[PDB]
């Protein structure tokens, strides 16, 4: 950040001052050599010692002092606050400081801040996460070096060994044809060997067959051609995702033989060292017999207008999830001019009946328009308190909390969704409080006392079994009445034989009754395990109980495969916010599974780091990132390279957009090409693992291909190359859209859901085609968009060729595909349209014009910017239907003028029917995913009533036939003959 | 009286979603209730929502052989009779925990009479004017919020910068203290020796150091003053936001009230869509 000539001040240890002149690219060792070569001339050089006994120290733009043990790093990358350098004797450790600097750069904030904060919960989290880190390290170092090879290169295996019959019939006699390349030669001479082998063959059988046809204790392994994907663990060759995708698409698989010793040597040795901080009257809650009382003293800062608002008040409550344990209590003593209340508020809930996950949600609200019957209360700031701390002790004595601003659009006064804790910023409304002192430490009783209390307080064959099953099969967000709750709690002992009903029984229990809660604790302790996609329900905000979440985590540990974990990682990260502590079973499980799989680690890091800017969970995510980067092995360097490249890209985009928005396209292109040609940018951008896929490697940028598109947001069309030797087999180059300015997290969620709908449809037995392409969020309003090749918008199609006849798309497809290819192209186009119509109808994606919908060359179509993943751009819960236009109808009808009069039309409608019924059958999982995505902070969902629009579109209120008729009438109204 | 039209009953609302039920019963006292048609749309369900303990409790009215009731056996003739009886008497007999009456019934007639200028052209013109006011207030609020976010970012970065200046000053002052500690003895020894070249060189270095420290102090002070000014602007923008939110809420509420009044007149919903804003407005 210092382009021109620099006059660096030198802060000698004897007290000298000298200003050397050096270029921006000089290194620290060169600077020290010149500095001690210039201090001899000036006085006080007798006390000066040799260079090797001294190191540097300065201050960076992040307001920290770094003692520079790494000398090879150049001056520009140091990021000094001011051009000055101080020479002091070394006091820290070489490796410790270098590692801490790398961790800080990867995270985005210095590692010294977490030592600066003195919160005992934070310190205990940092001390105790190292046990998990060490267990993961030991597990990686169990089978040397095959275990480390498995860690760095995860087998990309699907959870289902067997194949759906619609693609199992695509095999010839159940045999897969695979090309084997052997490149072992004096020169890089490529020879291929085509093998036709059964699907259930393991890699050792594949390698034996390859050797036998090569015409000759296995010293070789098999790698995907064109990517960093390896086949290591002995699993059926059809189970791997690349090979199954090749079977699905009819594409010819390609493999290649790498020596085991070559890869084993190529793997760096990973070392994990414990950091510095590794070395560095109570009575039970139930003995208390009193109500819960809390005092509110004053609001230090309040940004209220005197004229507009007269009175302001703070509203409180006791919550367990989103459900108030007791009725809310309000304060009203003083106007806005002098905020001070000093009122002992009393809650009609006994202390011994306080649940272990009890909280205290506050909000300073401003009552306006007191004149007239209607009183309007608008909140000024909100805060939450976790009445029980991480050591199982009730909060006692004086307390103070800064209060966060109310989120955009959150009208209701209390905000129990938000995270417990004070605002780190200190120029915010601070509301000092009080908690009654009980002359001792108020501790929650242990499980022995819980067990002693529990079980001591105590169609229709023998029970109403049909109603139990009906409630079980009912989705989580459906209305559950008081009669149903009483029935469920009364028949709790029989609910074990239906383990799919634990969520509903949990909602049935009365959380403000210790007898009921103890009985439910015993029931959950003896509960049988359930499906992981149902156990992920019990981690949402609606189930804050430690034992509920521990049972859900145990179920995840038992039954969560790694492909499913990578599918649900977005949500399993997002439900880290809903945790009330730092150290807990969910984060232990996720970190243990992120330090034994480098794809999980890559997306774990990038999802956690996507949310540094949000101060709400920034501290927890920063500490988690610190531990991950501490024990992530050698991948830290690749992560640092990715962070460098995206920092350069973000700076480029900012400078392009805000300083020179009025600058014309050509001049902006000139500036872009100049700054790309700039050597430090060039070096930072070349040669790093892509963030969208750790296997894909980005190579030499193509400055001629790179450009900025005509879209209003000015995104970057960045074209890389493939450094793999056999790049031609998969793809010669990588082009990626760098998007800066738009939130891509809604698109990320929509594409996750689309991928899951394909999984459901294919497992059922349909063949609908989707492209859930890659999207990543790398921070705030910044992200990566993977380009699909050979694609064109219908707007592009219409424009090309000269070119309003809706026959243009059909003519373009006919010109692209000829012969027998035409039938397959039209079939693929129709199946893609069916998937698109069903998916956009169900999720309520907004208006699609011509410019966000692309047709590939082989006839496949897909949808680009989702933007709003639900109809809340207009309203929640007539609503937005899917659209199917005249050109689509013409091509599906193979160019017939009477589109609705052909057989392919009703074939398409039947495919839509089956797809919709499959999604309506599996809507429970979609509801759980959308409800676990509540804490994202996206503008859309934010409570539950915006998730409810999926219930509306899927018609979970009606029955199956009624919903099918509803979809039929929706489709007919949609086209309305065109 | 005891058994009149369920449609004429004021607690009856018709086909409203549970979301609208929760919106209507948000932050209301105990005993509040309304009766709406069931979401399942199966005839005879008639879910009743009573708010006890701060929660929108749900109780379902079983319908059998021309009778109504909460649970078997059914002993009541009609929904109106059930509602009136449990308004008169509490629910403790039905459920021992549910010790509450049905005190405050939500009525659709109050909103019927609150709206003024009932004629069609008047409600249309008022709807248009209030929609324009609502759009103006919404764009003002969005601009205010983006300005607030920008100012918060500026405050955070300037606080980091001022902390960095404090650290720089600490380093410089420690170095100058070390310089004086060494230079006292050094200057004393060279004064004993009797030469002035190194003395003047050391003095030149010391005044150069002092000038640099003074410059950094001046820059830090200027940054701190700018930080105070930006903090004042941030507080002013927060005050304007807190002032402008209630007016936007009231405009939205009255616009929706006018929309519902217009729709409850038999006029075309296509005309409603065309007239309102035919735009991305929520309602």
CATH, residue B170: 1.10.287.1490
Q: Tell whether B47 and B108 lie within a shared domain.
A: yes
The backbone region for B29, taken as left when phi is positive above 0, alpha when psi lies in -120 to 50, beta otherwise, is beta
Q: Tell whether B82 and B164 lie within a shared domain.
A: no
Handedness of CA B173, B163, A277, A272 (dihedral sign): negative
- The closest of A235, A171, A161, A170 to A197, measured between CA atoms, is A171
**Are residues B58 and A479, on separate chains, in Cβ contact within 8 Å?**
yes
**Are residues A81 and B19, on separate chains, in Cβ contact within 8 Å?**
no
Instruction: Find chain B residues with C-beta within 8 A of A64's C-beta.
Output: 167
Question: Min CA distance, B5 vs chain A (Å)?
Answer: 26
Q: Tell whether B108 and B124 lie within a shared domain.
A: no
Q: Tell whether B144 and B101 lie within a shared domain.
A: no
Helix, strand, or coil (residue A235): coil
Instruction: Find chain A residues with C-beta within 8 A of B234's C-beta.
Output: 427
Cβ partners under 8 Å of residue A574, min gap 6:
A932, A933, A935, A936
- The closest of B30, B64, B62 to B48, measured between CA atoms, is B62
Q: Are A575 and A585 in contact (CB under 8 A)?
A: no
Element at B269 (helix H, strand E): helix B269-276
Question: Min CA distance, B8 vs chain A (Å)?
Answer: 25
Residue A876 contacts B, CB cutoff 8 Å: yes
Q: Tell whether B136 and B266 lie within a shared domain.
A: yes
Q: Tell whether B129 and B38 lie within a shared domain.
A: no
Least CB–CB distance from A59: residue in B40, B155, B171: B171
Q: Tell whether B43 and B141 lie within a shared domain.
A: no
Q: Tell whether B100 and B226 lie within a shared domain.
A: no
Laid out side by side, the sheet with A792-793 consists of A792-793, A853-855, A861-863
Rg (CA), chain B: 36
In a domain, B1, yes or no: no
In a domain, B7, yes or no: no
The whole-angstrom separation of Cα A916 and Cα A966 is 11
**Are residues B70 and A483, on separate chains, in Cβ contact within 8 Å?**
yes
Distances in Å between the alpha carbon of A764 and those of A562, A908, A960? 22, 17, 17
The whole-angstrom separation of Cα B81 and Cα B69 is 10
Residue A380 contacts B, CB cutoff 8 Å: yes
The whole-angstrom separation of Cα A824 and Cα A608 is 42
Please count the structural domains in chain B.
2
Q: Tell whether B80 and B209 lie within a shared domain.
A: no
Which two three-digit tokens encode residue A127?
């001390």
> Which CATH number fits the domain that encloses residue B63?
3.30.505.10
**Are residues B178 and A876, on separate chains, in Cβ contact within 8 Å?**
no
In a domain, B4, yes or no: no
In a domain, B3, yes or no: no
The whole-angstrom separation of Cα A673 and Cα A344 is 67
**Are residues B238 and A303, on separate chains, in Cβ contact within 8 Å?**
yes
Least CA distance to A309: which residue of chain B?
Answer: B243
The whole-angstrom separation of Cα A927 and Cα A536 is 11
- What's the DSSP call for residue A539? G
Cβ partners under 8 Å of residue A612, min gap 6:
A107, A108, A109, A618, A621, A622, A779
Handedness of CA A769, A774, A776, A782 (dihedral sign): negative
Instruction: Find chain A residues with C-beta within 8 A of B216's C-beta.
Output: 82
**Are residues B55 and A377, on separate chains, in Cβ contact within 8 Å?**
no
Q: Tell whether B84 and B137 lie within a shared domain.
A: no
Residue A779 contacts B, CB cutoff 8 Å: no
**Experimental determination technique:** cryo-EM
Handedness of CA A960, A966, A971, A972 (dihedral sign): positive
Least CB–CB distance from A14: residue in B19, B70, B182: B182
Phi, psi of A844 (to 5 degrees): 65, 40
Least CB–CB distance from B59: residue in A84, A317, A483: A483
Cβ partners under 8 Å of residue A163, min gap 6:
A171, A199, A238, A244, A247
**Are residues B17 and A60, on separate chains, in Cβ contact within 8 Å?**
no
Least CA distance to B277: which residue of chain A?
Answer: A874
Q: How many CB atoms lie within 10 A of CB B240?
A: 18
Instruction: Find chain A residues with C-beta within 8 A of B168's C-beta.
Output: 59, 81-82, 84
In a domain, B283, yes or no: no
- The closest of A921, A924, A923, A928 to A537, measured between CA atoms, is A928
Question: Min CA distance, A98 vs chain B (Å)?
Answer: 21
The whole-angstrom separation of Cα B77 and Cα B68 is 6
CA atoms within 13 A on the CB side of B64: 10
**Are residues A326 and B246, on separate chains, in Cβ contact within 8 Å?**
no
In a domain, B263, yes or no: yes
Q: Which of residues 430-459 of A touch B (CB under 8 A)?
A: none
Element at B154 (helix H, strand E): helix B120-193
Instruction: Find chain A residues with C-beta within 8 A of B160's C-beta.
Output: 61-63
**Are residues A377 and B27, on separate chains, in Cβ contact within 8 Å?**
yes
**Are residues A308 and B243, on separate chains, in Cβ contact within 8 Å?**
yes
Q: Are A868 and A805 in contact (CB under 8 A)?
A: no
Least CB–CB distance from B19: residue in A47, A480, A877: A877
**Are residues B155 and A16, on separate chains, in Cβ contact within 8 Å?**
no
Q: Tell whether B21 and B103 lie within a shared domain.
A: yes
Among residues B68, B98, B114, the one where a domain terminates is B114
Q: How many CB atoms lie within 10 A of CB A144?
A: 11
Chain breaks in chain A (C to N over 2.5 A) after: 216, 280, 458, 802, 803, 877
Q: Tell whether B129 and B248 lie within a shared domain.
A: yes
Least CA distance to A330: which residue of chain B?
Answer: B27
Structural domain for B18, as ranges: 12-114
Domains of chain A: 1-95 (3.10.20.90), 96-141+446-632 (1.25.40.70), 142-266 (3.10.20.90), 288-445 (2.60.40.150), 633-789 (3.30.1010.10), 790-978 (1.10.1070.11)
The structure was resolved to a resolution in Å of 3.3
Question: Min CA distance, B218 vs chain A (Å)?
Answer: 14
**Are residues A44 and B242, on separate chains, in Cβ contact within 8 Å?**
no
């Amino acid at each position: 950040l210092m382009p021109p000539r620099i006059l660096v001040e030198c802060l000698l240890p004897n007290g000298m001052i000298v200003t050397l002149e050096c270029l921006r690219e000089a290194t620290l060792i060169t600077i020290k050599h010149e500095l001690f070569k210039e201090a001899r001339k000036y006085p006080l050089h007798q006390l000066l010692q040799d260079e090797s006994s001294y190191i540097f120290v300065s201050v960076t733009q992040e307001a920290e002092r770094e003692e520079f043990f790494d000398e090879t790093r150049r001056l520009c990358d140091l990021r000094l606050f001011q051009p000055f350098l101080k020479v002091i004797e070394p006091v820290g450790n070489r490796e410790e400081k270098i590692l801490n600097r790398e961790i800080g750069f990867a995270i985005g904030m210095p590692v010294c801040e977490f030592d600066m904060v003195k919160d005992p919960e934070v310190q205990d989290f940092r001390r105790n996460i190292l046990n998990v880190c060490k267990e993961a390290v030991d597990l990686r170092d169990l089978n040397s070096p095959h275990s480390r090879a498995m860690y760095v290169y995860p087998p990309n295996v699907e959870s289902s060994p067997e194949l759906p019959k619609h693609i199992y019939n695509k095999l010839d006699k159940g045999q897969i044809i695979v090309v084997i390349w052997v490149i072992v030669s004096p020169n890089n001479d490529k020879q291929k060997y085509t093998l036709k082998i059964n699907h259930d063959c393991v890699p050792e059988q594949v390698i034996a067959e390859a050797i036998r046809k090569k015409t000759r204790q296995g010293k070789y392994i098999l790698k995907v051609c064109g990517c960093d994907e390896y086949f290591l663990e002995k699993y059926p060759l059809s189970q791997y995702k690349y090979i199954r995708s090749c079977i699905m698409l009819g594409r010819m698989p390609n493999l290649m033989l790498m020596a085991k010793e070559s890869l084993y040597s190529q793997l760096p040795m990973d070392c994990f060292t414990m950091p510095s901080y590794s070395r560095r009257s109570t009575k039970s809650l139930w003995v208390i017999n009193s109500a819960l009382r809390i005092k509110i003293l004053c609001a230090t800062y309040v940004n209220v207008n005197i004229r507009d608002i007269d009175k302001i008040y703070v509203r409180t409550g006791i919550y367990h999830g989103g459900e108030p344990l007791c009725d809310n209590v309000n304060t009203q003593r003083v106007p806005c001019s002098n905020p001070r209340w000093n009122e002992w508020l009393n809650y009609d809930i006994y202390i011994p009946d306080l649940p272990r996950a009890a909280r205290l949600c506050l909000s300073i609200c401003s009552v306006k328009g007191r004149k007239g019957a209607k009183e309007e209360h608008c909140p000024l700031a909100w805060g939450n308190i976790n009445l029980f701390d991480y050591t199982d002790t009730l909060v006692s004595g004086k307390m103070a909390l800064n209060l966060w601003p109310v989120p955009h659009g959150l009208e209701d006064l209390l905000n129990p969704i938000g995270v417990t804790g004070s605002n780190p910023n200190k120029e915010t409304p601070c509301l000092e409080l009080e908690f009654d002192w009980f002359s001792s430490v108020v501790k929650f009783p242990d499980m022995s006392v819980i067990e002693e209390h529990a079980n001591w307080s105590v169609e229709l064959r023998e029970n109403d079994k049909e109603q139990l099953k009906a409630i079980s099969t009912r989705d989580p967000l459906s209305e559950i009445t008081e009669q149903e709750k009483d029935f469920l709690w009364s028949h709790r002992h029989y609910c074990v034989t239906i383990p799919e009903i634990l969520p509903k029984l949990l909602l049935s229990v009365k959380w403000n009754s210790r007898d009921e809660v103890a009985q439910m604790y015993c029931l959950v302790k003896d509960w049988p395990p359930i499906k992981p996609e149902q156990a992920m329900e019990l981690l949402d905000c609606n189930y804050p109980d430690p034992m509920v979440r521990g049972f859900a985590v145990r179920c995840l540990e038992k039954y969560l495969t790694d492909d499913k974990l990578s599918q649900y990682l977005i949500q399993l990260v997002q439900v880290l916010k809903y945790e009330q502590y730092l150290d807990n079973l969910l984060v232990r499980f996720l970190l243990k599974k992120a330090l034994t799989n480098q794809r999980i680690g890559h997306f774990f890091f990038w999802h956690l780091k996507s949310e540094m800017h949000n101060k709400t969970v920034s501290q927890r995510f920063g500490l988690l990132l610190e531990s991950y980067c501490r024990a992530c092995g050698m991948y830290l360097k690749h992560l640092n390279r990715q962070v460098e490249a995206m920092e350069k890209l973000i700076n480029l985009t900012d400078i392009l957009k805000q300083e020179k928005k009025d600058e014309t396209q050509k001049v902006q292109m000139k500036f872009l090409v100049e700054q790309m040609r700039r050597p430090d940018f060039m070096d930072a951008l070349q040669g790093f693992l892509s963030p969208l896929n750790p296997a894909h490697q980005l190579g030499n940028l193509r400055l001629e291909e790179c450009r900025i598109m005509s879209s209003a947001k000015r995104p970057l069309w960045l074209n890389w190359e493939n450094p793999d030797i056999m790049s031609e087999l998969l793809f010669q180059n990588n082009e990626i859209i760098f998007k800066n300015g738009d939130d891509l997290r809604q698109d990320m969620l929509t594409l996750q859901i689309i991928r899951i709908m394909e999984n459901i449809w294919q497992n059922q037995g349909l063949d609908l085609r989707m492209l859930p392409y890659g999207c990543l969020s790398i921070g705030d309003c910044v992200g990566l968009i993977e380009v699909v090749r050979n694609s064109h918008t219908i707007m592009q199609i219409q424009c090309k060729g000269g070119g309003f006849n809706s026959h243009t798309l059909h003519q373009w497809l006919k010109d692209k595909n000829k012969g027998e290819i035409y039938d397959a192209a039209i079939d693929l186009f129709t199946r893609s349209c069916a998937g698109y119509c069903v998916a956009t109808f169900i999720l309520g994606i907004g208006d699609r014009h011509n410019s966000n919908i692309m047709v590939k060359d082989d006839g496949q179509l897909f949808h680009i910017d989702f933007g709003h993943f639900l109809d809340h751009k207009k309203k929640k819960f007539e609503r937005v239907p899917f659209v199917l236009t005249q050109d689509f109808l013409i091509v599906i009808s193979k160019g017939a003028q009477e589109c609705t009069k052909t057989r392919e039309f009703e074939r398409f409608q039947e495919m839509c029917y089956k797809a919709y019924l499959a999604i309506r059958q599996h809507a429970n999982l979609f509801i759980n995913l959308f409800s676990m995505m509540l804490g994202s902070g996206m503008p859309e969902l934010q409570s539950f009533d915006d998730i409810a629009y999926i219930r509306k579109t899927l018609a979970l209120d009606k029955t199956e036939q009624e919903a099918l008729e509803y979809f039929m009438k929706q489709m007919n109204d949609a086209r309305h003959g065109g | 009286n005891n058994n009149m039209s369920l449609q004429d009953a004021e607690w009856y609302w018709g086909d409203i979603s549970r979301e609208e039920v929760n919106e209507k019963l948000r932050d209301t006292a105990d005993g509040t209730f309304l009766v709406r048609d069931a979401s399942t749309k199966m005839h005879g369900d008639y879910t009743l929502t009573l708010r006890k303990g701060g929660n929108n409790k749900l109780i379902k009215i079983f319908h059998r052989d021309g009778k109504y009731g909460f649970s078997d056996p059914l002993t009541f003739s009609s929904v109106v009779e059930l509602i009136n009886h449990y308004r008169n008497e509490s629910l403790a007999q039905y459920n021992p925990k549910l010790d509450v009456k049905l005190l405050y019934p939500v009525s659709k007639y109050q909103q019927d009479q609150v709206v003024k200028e009932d004629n069609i052209e008047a409600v249309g013109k008022k709807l248009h004017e209030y929609n324009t006011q609502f759009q103006e207030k919404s764009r003002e609020y969005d601009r205010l919020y983006e300005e607030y976010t920008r100012t918060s970012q500026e405050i955070q970065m300037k606080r980091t910068a001022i902390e960095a200046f404090n650290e720089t000053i600490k380093i410089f002052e420690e170095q100058c203290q070390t310089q004086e500690r060494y230079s006292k003895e050094y200057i004393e020894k060279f004064k004993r020796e009797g030469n002035e070249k190194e003395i003047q060189r050391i003095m030149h270095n010391y005044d150069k150091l002092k000038s640099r420290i003074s410059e950094i102090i001046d820059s830090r002070r200027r940054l701190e003053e700018d930080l105070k000014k930006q903090a004042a602007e941030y507080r002013e923008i927060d005050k304007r936001m807190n002032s402008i939110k209630p007016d936007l809420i009231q405009l939205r509420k009255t616009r929706d009230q006018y929309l519902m009044w217009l729709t409850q007149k038999g006029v075309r919903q296509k005309k409603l869509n065309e007239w309102l804003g035919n735009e991305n407005t929520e309602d």
